[PDB]
Design a protein around this ligand. Structure first.
Ligand code: ZN
Ligand code: ZN
Length: 89
């Protein structure tokens, strides 16, 4: 009985997802935040116990946690880069 909403929500922060991005439904805020890191191959180090609350009603939250949450919820990196997607083991 969890119905009655306005469109899809961001599985990362909850923000109204702007459509299925990277295989998963994520908002525009995380949509870019995920790529900018994926396409760039970045890697943040959560100074915390990787338990930072990645919500929407919260200013710039953790980076590693927020970014990771993507690979957790479902967001796939392969997508970030269209075309052939090789594997570096
Ligand atoms: Zn989001
Ligand atoms: Zn964190």
């Amino acid at each position: 009985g969890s119905s009655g909403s306005s469109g899809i929500e961001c599985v990362v922060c909850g923000d109204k997802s702007s459509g299925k991005h990277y295989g998963q439904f994520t908002c525009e805020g995380c949509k870019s935040f995920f790529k900018r890191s994926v396409r760039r191959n970045l890697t943040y180090t959560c100074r915390a116990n990787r338990n930072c609350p990645i919500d929407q009603h919260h200013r710039n939250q953790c980076q590693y946690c927020r970014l990771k949450k993507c690979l957790k919820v479902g967001m796939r990196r392969e997508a970030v880069q269209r075309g052939s997607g090789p594997s570096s083991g």
